Ligand binder design. Structure first.
Ligand code: BCL
Ligand code: BCL
Ligand code: BCL
Ligand code: BCL
Ligand code: BCL
Ligand code: BCL
Ligand SMILES: CC[C@H]1c2cc3[nH]c4c(c3C)C(=O)[C@H](C(=O)OC)c4c3nc(cc4[nH]c(cc(n2)[C@@H]1C)c(C(C)=O)c4C)[C@@H](C)[C@@H]3CCC(=O)OC/C=C(\C)CCC[C@H](C)CCC[C@H](C)CCCC(C)C
Ligand SMILES: CC[C@H]1c2cc3[nH]c4c(c3C)C(=O)[C@H](C(=O)OC)c4c3nc(cc4[nH]c(cc(n2)[C@@H]1C)c(C(C)=O)c4C)[C@@H](C)[C@@H]3CCC(=O)OC/C=C(\C)CCC[C@H](C)CCC[C@H](C)CCCC(C)C
Ligand SMILES: COC1=C(OC)C(=O)C(C/C=C(\C)CC/C=C(\C)CC/C=C(\C)CC/C=C(\C)CC/C=C(\C)CC/C=C(\C)CC/C=C(\C)CCC=C(C)C)=C(C)C1=O
Ligand SMILES: COC(C)(C)C/C=C/C(C)=C/C=C/C(C)=C/C=C/C(C)=C/C=C\C=C(C)\C=C\C=C(C)\C=C\C=C(C)\C=C\CC(C)(C)OC
Ligand SMILES: [Ba+2]
Ligand SMILES: [Ba+2]
Ligand SMILES: [Ba+2]
Ligand SMILES: [Ba+2]
Ligand SMILES: [Ba+2]
Ligand SMILES: [Fe+3]
Lengths: 40, 258, 60, 280, 318, 60, 60, 40, 40, 60, 60, 40, 40, 40
């Protein structure tokens, strides 16, 4: 898969952090949206 | 005011979007169109000594590389091709004039007889064995039940004279089919290829007509630098000769008619 | 156990470049889609005329 | 100007008519005797379409006169003129323009013919072209003739001819039921499928994933055989596509040829022969 | 006289070819080949083998389900009289949920079968999509097919799923029947004010005519250079031959410019993909954005005026 | 699970990978089919107003 | 142990990469699907006016 | 189908038990279904 | 399928945990869905 | 400004030229789209008679 | 301390000839475009009847 | 991508502030737009 | 690509001022336009 | 059929009992059906 065993820990390290960051942006926007106009 | 009709509706602006994407598309396709044959040939380039390379609008696209399978190479487009002399002389020195072929028209290798220099290597099967080979090299191949076997029919030129007889049949190892007819020429018993595209059958008679060249011309069919395979170069050289007969093989295909 | 512990190894299995770009595409498309979904329902936020209407904002 | 590999083929001769008289090139277009005739037919035709746009149906000052590209239209004469030449300003113009268009297309075809003779290639293109020329003729010559008047031809205008198609089609109530129409539509569609499939294949093999080399004949066949259990093969797909497109034009020509002259009733009614067989 | 390369006049056989090898994961291939002397008369005589994976089998499955609901329903509509079914087949069909239902899942007897056949058909089509991408990857090739199929799927989805939902009514999707679906087309144009003045449908019509023009031209060309092995477009693309040269030049001398053996396939590709892509756009706007195309065209001054030689007074106004 | 014969031999006759794929596919189809049929019949369990009405708990 | 005491062996017969990615696609589509299903029934949550009709608030 | 007699005992065994577990799950779903909302 | 018995146990285990985590998120969503909005 | 720090390594995976042009195209398109969206809604600023009607600067 | 300070290097990555010609073209098109857009709306400056009506060389 | 590990710090460094600059111009024009013509 | 670092600093300099000049002529036109015909 | 003469005997044996089993399950389901819901 053209990666080494250390660069799938490393890549993964970066991915996990980036995704959790993004999801952070998401839960943020959705809470704001729930504030202005709750949908449930 | 709950009625201010807007003059621009989604259909207008979407037809606009279309036309813009369209223009970019047209341009792009015209750029791929110049991956061969370009820059053009004018006496504008030669008059200027070359400071006027002819390319038009749009311009030429960055070369693209094709990576041939099997240690084959790398091809590029657009590329820089070495000029090649013309085996003919201007029918007029005026521009846009055609050229008359030099010498015996079929030998000229000009006009319907012209052709480029394709590789001096062979097209290959997936495996990498010469794609086009004769049935003698391709042991496995076989005529289809109920089809006259070409092997043994008589090849006859455009004026009804025998040329030779079919000594074998060349086939595609990639897409099973008759690509070439082999011709043991009568006049010198030398072996030549005859493209299927130039050959007509006369099954009840076991003949293989050729309106293309005359029986005699079969004597000058370009030859193979090896009788169990053929190169790309050789395929062009073979077909183009026959093609020449379409305008040269008679002192009349030259046209007019009236 | 909720905990993975060897799920780095997934990039020993799935091309990272492709999975990445895949996510880019899937997210941008989904964003476009659901945006349109919201725009077509009650929860729409553009043609609301809130807090003041612009289309009947003038006597002229 | 020439392609970078063109001079070696620019041989002399091959005409049908003219010989060295018009046997020369102009820029990239080949002239030849039929190009000169063609250019004459074409130019006068267009230039006349220009005069028709200039005068309009009721005169140059009228509100119906127009230079708007969508609405300019030159329509045939009324049926009252039958097969006679009608006055210029009463559909005559349309007749002449038609003569010019037909002559230009037939010239064009013959010029492709001289061009095949020059290059030593097959005459498949101008033969194929001749199907469109045939289609055009039923739509301006054959049909209106069988129908005792040239006025049955369609007008030469961007949307007016669309209107023509529309009302002639609707005279038969539900044209979709025309069986030749159903055929022709199927061929136009199938043509569109093969074209999209061939296109896709060639571009999918000559340009594969980075890291892969130009693909092969074996790939080509293995793919469509993988998906749908068959591959008609390279040559033949060029053969089929030509079949589909030429047939599509054919059945369009026959589908309209039978609408009037050989069938006057509504078209769905035609299918009656099927609900009335003595099987049911 | 000269052979036209219309009919293989003499054919040849070799043991069938199971094809290039797929990597691990792409399951075995099934079925064992046969040759049809007649297909052979016009094309590769080999019939199969075929590949069938999870995708492919799950698609054959959904697709046949959908074909069964449509059919069974048609037999039911003539009372299980298979004779009558045979008699009116062209006219038989499975109509869509009625409007009273909107986009709700309706009762079996009122359209629910259509929604199930629509459901399963679409799923089976998009599965055939994935299938063709898988089948296209195992060979290292590119996704050109898949981008076109995706265009045609786009139009399909626009016809029976996207527009209905946007318009809030399954009754707006197209019904399954030959003549019935012909009627849906005509009624469709009538309802929205003559689809001829709908620009997108004009372009799609230009692209359909164009797929016919391009395939006719290119096909005629390739056969005309079939004497130079011009059909072997792959190597004429890598190692340009007098086939690709005579080919590009025929057009150059006729209409003043030309393309190349590789690029003509790009013109063709894009022109086919364009039909379906203008077409779907055309349906997208019908009812959602424009309700009367004839009117739309009048608003943009494209509709012609003719001397009003025949006219009728409007009873609604008396 | 009570003996039957030599009905294991089926796998000398029928390829295991393929039967697996057959069952997975067939079952998936049947599952969606019946689910929708029921969703399309009176036994509907969604559009019933169960157990508290949702379309007249907010259009209000 | 009365249970698939050798059910790793499935990944000796069925390609893990394909099966995984296939699994992901399958769930994403089913999610899309069922969501669409719910949207078509009484249980719909968008064209509902929850918690207040927006197509009838605004000043104006 | 390229199997030896022993991998048709093993595959048949694992197959059988898995299918029986599945049939179990089904009978479960049908029983829950039968209790909550009879159709017979 | 180019795996050894150790990379199918390794895979099976990690898979099982991942699949269970996802399913966990599922019952999570089903509980939130069930409290505010019972469906059965 | 990553914000920290080895997310530069992202250009070790995705071509800088391609990523750049991709963003350029994506944005150059999106801008037009929303421009259009705005043109059909309350935020339309042209055919509004704002601040004074111009086809009422004469007659037509 | 920021970083917009090596933003010349852009001409080491994107062909200047192309970026230029691209921009030149893009602008000419955008110009014709916007001109037409305004021309189809109220802000039109052709059919305004301003400042001396030409179709009013008489009683109009 | 035929870059050294040092020359994507570089590309990243310049890219990020430029991207952010764009976001800035955007937030500005959006505020200007919001003041002149609020949409929510 | 294929300029020295000095001629893309130069090119960037000349480009930048030239573009800013265009921005100038445009701002000119937009102000006249706002004057003769307010749109906001 | 690439089988031996004894291995169409064995297959037949196994086939026959398996088939009588299916037709039987069927007769059962058919009686189950007939008591609760007569159709004739
Ligand atoms: C009633 C509903 C609310 C609504 C509620 C929400 C909610 C809730 C959300 C959004 C979110 C989004 N909304 Mg909103 N939104 C509404 C009104 C709008 C309007 C408008 C015209 O009025 C607009 C333009 C938007 C626009 C946006 C999109 C910009 C955004 C989702 C981006 C996306 O799809 O992922 C694609 C984007 C990416 C994948 C990231 C781009 C990363 C770039 C390309 C990479 C930079 C390089 C990086 C440094 C290194 C490489 C990293 C890897 C590439 C990853 N909304 C209405 C008012 N909107 C979503 C959000 O906040 O962001 C998640 C969200 O959760
Ligand atoms: C309006 C009500 C009826 C209707 C009534 C008709 C009628 C009436 C007709 C058709 C026609 C046809 N219809 Mg219909 N049709 C209907 C619905 C449909 C539907 C659909 C989706 O429902 C489809 C796909 C079609 C499609 C078709 C095609 C099968 C066919 C036209 C092919 C053709 O012209 O080829 C022929 C191609 C040509 C004639 C062009 C020839 C080219 C010439 C030689 C060169 C021109 C050169 C020129 C100068 C180029 C200019 C270039 C510039 C110089 C640069 N119709 C509706 C239901 N339809 C026509 C037909 O049947 O076939 C003729 C026809 O008369
Ligand atoms: C009848 C009155 C109107 C008319 C109304 C319409 C309407 C309404 C429509 C068209 C449509 C089309 N019309 Mg029209 N059309 C008319 C007159 C014409 C004329 C003519 C000469 O006058 C022509 C040439 C055309 C031509 C065309 C085509 C260009 C265009 C779409 C083509 C296509 O293939 O999409 C068809 C291709 C597909 C749908 C994709 C197929 C892919 C699917 C997934 C295949 C699945 C296969 C299946 C799974 C296999 C199992 C089988 C099962 C049994 C199902 N029309 C008249 C004026 N026309 C379309 C359009 O333009 O909309 C703007 C359309 O929907
Ligand atoms: C109409 C009356 C009841 C109903 C009665 C039943 C009954 C009865 C059954 C199901 C079954 C299923 N139902 Mg239910 N079900 C109802 C309402 C729902 C709703 C909903 C939104 O309202 C949903 C999402 C589901 C969803 C599901 C699927 C998760 C499940 C398996 C079948 C399947 O996936 O098909 C296609 C897929 C397969 C057939 C799988 C084939 C693959 C192998 C053999 C099995 C492994 C699959 C997977 C790992 C098993 C997951 C579920 C496990 C039980 C945890 N049901 C209605 C209310 N449902 C079946 C079940 O629970 O599993 C026994 C079942 O027998
Ligand atoms: C002003 C009237 C129109 C508007 C018209 C335009 C026009 C015209 C353009 C954009 C463009 C952009 N718009 Mg906008 N845009 C508006 C509504 C929105 C909303 C929203 C939540 O409502 C969002 C997120 C956006 C987002 C953006 C970006 C997607 C995009 C430019 C930068 C970019 O892509 O990177 C992402 C950028 C961001 C993520 C930053 C978000 C932008 C600002 C800060 C969001 C404003 C809303 C925000 C919630 C603050 C509102 C103020 C408070 C209510 C007081 N717009 C309103 C509806 N928008 C430009 C474009 O697309 O091409 C590049 C463009 O040409
Ligand atoms: C809508 C209300 C006003 C209006 C308001 C504006 C506003 C506001 C603007 C214009 C601007 C433009 N208007 Mg105005 N304009 C009006 C009516 C008109 C009418 C008319 C028939 O009535 C015309 C012809 C024009 C014409 C034009 C263009 C000349 C110009 C934009 C150039 C462009 O886009 O190209 C593309 C531009 C470029 C590529 C940059 C310019 C560089 C030129 C083209 C040279 C290219 C370089 C080339 C390679 C040559 C090399 C140079 C040598 C080295 C020296 N306007 C209406 C009445 N108009 C714009 C402008 O700047 O001009 C004042 C502008 O901002
Ligand atoms: C028969 C199968 C398909 C086909 C085949 C086909 N067409 C062909 C060819 C072939 C093989 C060519 O080789 C030839 C060509 O040169 O390739 C582009 C051609 C051709 N296909 C063209 C058009 C064309 N083909 C069409 C269709 C078809 N052609 C079929 C789909 C269509 C349509 C209606 O769908 C069109 C529009 C031309 C570009 C070209 C032939 C052009 C030509 O011969 O030029 C000479 C004539 C002129 C330059 C114009 C003469 C001026 C006239 C006096 C005025 C015209 C009046 C006209 C009647 C009014 C119509 C007004 C419209 C607004 C309605
Ligand atoms: C530019 C768009 C054009 C186009 C392109 C296009 N079409 C395409 C594609 C593309 C790119 C594909 O990739 C795909 C294809 O496969 O090409 C061959 C396809 C496709 N286009 C097709 C049809 C089609 N496309 C059309 C149109 C168009 N397609 C446009 C012209 C049309 C029209 C409107 O005329 C049609 C009718 C199909 C051949 C194919 C999609 C097939 C599909 O989705 O399959 C779904 C499932 C089934 C059909 C079920 C299979 C039924 C089997 C025949 C039964 C076999 C039974 C078997 C013996 C097993 C036993 C049964 C067991 C249950 C017991
Ligand atoms: C690179 O090369 C390629 C391959 O090679 C490897 C491929 O294999 C492939 C795969 C290709 C395929 C699988 C081909 C697929 C084709 C499809 C799906 C088309 C569908 C066609 C059918 C179902 C058959 C329809 C036709 C019939 C039943 C015949 C009916 C006969 C009728 C109506 C009467 C005939 C008479 C007429 C039509 C009247 C007059 C007609 C003419 C004058 C036409 C003249 C024709 C010629 C050819 C000169 C591709 C795409 C490719 O690009
Ligand atoms: C006796 O017969 C036996 C053999 C049983 C079987 C015979 C079967 C036969 C002969 C069948 C014949 C069928 C024919 C001829 C069918 C022809 C159909 C035609 C011509 C159709 C034409 C157009 C149809 C279209 C475009 C359909 C579009 C439908 C769509 C796009 C439906 C989409 C629905 C979806 C995606 C469903 C969503 C469900 C959701 C999830 C939303 O539900 C909540
Ligand atoms: Ba609202
Ligand atoms: Ba407003
Ligand atoms: Ba009777
Ligand atoms: Ba509700
Ligand atoms: Ba005005
Ligand atoms: Fe081709």
């Amino acid at each position: 898969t053209g990666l080494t065993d250390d660069e799938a820990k490393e890549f993964h390290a970066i991915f996990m952090q980036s995704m959790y960051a993004w999801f952070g942006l998401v839960v943020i926007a959705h809470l704001l949206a729930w504030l202005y106009r709750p949908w449930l | 005011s709950a009625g201010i009709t807007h003059y621009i509706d989604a259909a207008q602006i979407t037809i606009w979007a279309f036309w813009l994407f369209f223009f970019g598309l047209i341009i792009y396709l015209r750029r791929e169109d110049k991956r061969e044959g370009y820059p053009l040939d004018s006496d504008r380039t030669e008059r200027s000594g070359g400071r006027v390379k002819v390319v038009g609008f749009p311009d030429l696209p960055d070369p693209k590389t094709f990576v041939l399978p099997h240690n084959g190479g790398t091809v590029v487009a657009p590329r820089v091709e070495a000029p090649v002399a013309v085996n003919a002389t201007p029918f007029s020195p005026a521009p846009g004039s055609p050229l008359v072929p030099n010498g015996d028209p079929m030998l000229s290798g000009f006009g319907p007889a012209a052709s480029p220099d394709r590789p001096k290597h062979c097209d290959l099967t997936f495996e990498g064995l010469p794609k086009i080979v004769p049935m003698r090299v391709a042991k496995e191949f076989s005529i289809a039940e109920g089809d006259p076997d070409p092997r043994g029919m008589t090849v006859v030129g455009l004026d009804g004279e025998v040329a030779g007889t079919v000594s074998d049949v060349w086939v595609d190892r990639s897409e099973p089919q008759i690509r070439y007819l082999e011709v043991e020429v009568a006049a010198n018993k030398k072996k030549v290829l005859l493209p299927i595209g130039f050959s007509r059958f006369d099954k009840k008679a076991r003949k293989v007509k050729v309106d293309a060249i005359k029986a005699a011309h079969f004597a000058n069919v370009p030859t193979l630098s090896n009788p169990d395979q053929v190169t790309l170069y050789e395929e062009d050289k073979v077909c183009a000769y026959y093609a020449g007969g379409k305008l040269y093989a008679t002192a009349e295909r030259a046209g007019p008619l009236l | 156990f909720t905990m993975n512990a060897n799920l780095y190894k997934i990039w020993l299995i799935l091309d990272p470049r492709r999975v990445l770009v895949s996510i880019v595409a899937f997210q941008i498309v989904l964003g476009l889609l659901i945006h349109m979904i919201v725009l077509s329902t009650d929860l729409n936020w553009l043609d609301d005329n809130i807090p003041v209407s612009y289309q009947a904002l003038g006597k002229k | 100007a020439m392609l970078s590999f063109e001079k070696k083929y620019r041989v002399r001769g091959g005409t049908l008519i003219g010989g060295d008289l018009f046997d020369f090139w102009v820029g990239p277009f080949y002239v030849g005797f039929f190009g000169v005739v063609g250019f004459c037919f074409t130019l006068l035709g267009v230039l006349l379409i220009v005069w028709g746009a200039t005068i309009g149906p009721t005169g140059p000052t009228s509100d119906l006169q127009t230079y708007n590209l969508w609405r300019i239209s030159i329509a045939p004469p009324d049926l009252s003129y039958g097969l006679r030449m009608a006055p210029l300003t009463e559909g005559g113009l349309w007749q002449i323009i038609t003569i010019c268009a037909a002559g230009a297309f037939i010239s064009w075809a013959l010029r492709e013919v001289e061009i095949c003779r020059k290059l030593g290639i097959g005459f498949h293109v101008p033969f194929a072209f001749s199907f469109a020329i045939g289609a055009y003729l039923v739509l301006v010559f054959v049909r209106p003739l069988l129908m005792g008047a040239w006025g049955h031809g369609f007008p030469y205008g961007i949307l007016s001819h669309l209107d023509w198609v529309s009302n002639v089609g609707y005279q038969f109530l539900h044209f979709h039921y025309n069986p030749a129409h159903m055929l022709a539509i199927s061929f136009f569609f199938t043509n569109c499928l093969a074209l999209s499939m061939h296109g896709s294949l060639i571009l999918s093999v000559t340009n594969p994933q980075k890291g892969e080399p130009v693909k092969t004949s074996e790939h080509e066949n293995t793919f469509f055989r993988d998906i749908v259990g068959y591959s008609i093969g390279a040559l033949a797909i060029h053969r089929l596509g030509l079949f589909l497109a030429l047939s599509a034009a054919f059945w369009s020509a026959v589908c309209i040829l039978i609408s009037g002259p050989f069938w006057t009733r509504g078209w769905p009614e035609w299918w009656n022969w099927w609900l009335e067989l003595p099987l049911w | 006289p000269e052979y036209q390369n219309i009919f293989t006049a003499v054919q040849v056989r070799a043991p069938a070819y199971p094809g290039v090898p797929l990597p691990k994961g792409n399951l075995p291939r099934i079925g064992r080949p046969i040759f049809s002397y007649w297909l052979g008369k016009i094309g590769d005589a080999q019939i199969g083998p075929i590949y069938l994976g999870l995708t492919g089998t799950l698609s054959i499955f959904f697709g046949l389900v959908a074909i069964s609901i449509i059919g069974f329903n048609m037999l039911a509509s003539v009372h299980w009289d298979v004779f009558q079914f045979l008699k009116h087949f062209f006219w038989l069909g499975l109509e869509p949920p009625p409007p009273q239902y909107g986009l709700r899942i309706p009762p079996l007897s009122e359209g629910g079968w259509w929604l199930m056949a629509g459901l399963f058909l679409t799923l089976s089509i998009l599965l055939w999509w994935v299938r063709t991408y898988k089948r296209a990857e195992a060979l290292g090739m590119s996704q050109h097919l898949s981008w076109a199929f995706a265009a045609a799927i786009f139009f399909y989805l626009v016809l029976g799923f996207i527009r209905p939902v946007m318009m809030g009514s399954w009754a707006k999707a197209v019904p399954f029947g030959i003549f019935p679906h012909l009627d849906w087309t005509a009624a469709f144009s009538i309802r929205y004010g003559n689809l001829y003045y709908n620009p997108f449908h004009m372009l799609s019509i230009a692209f359909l005519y164009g797929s016919a023009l391009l395939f006719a031209m290119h096909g005629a060309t390739i056969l005309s250079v079939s004497r130079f092995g011009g059909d072997r477009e792959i190597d004429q693309i890598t190692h340009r031959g007098t086939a690709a040269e005579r080919a590009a030049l025929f057009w150059r001398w006729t209409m003043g410019f030309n393309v190349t053996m590789e690029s003509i396939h790009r013109w063709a590709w894009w022109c086919a993909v364009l039909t379906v892509i203008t077409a779907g756009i055309g349906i997208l706007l019908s009812g959602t954005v424009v309700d009367n195309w004839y009117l739309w065209a009048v608003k943009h001054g494209m509709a012609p005026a003719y001397p009003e030689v025949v006219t009728a007074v409007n009873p609604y106004e008396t």
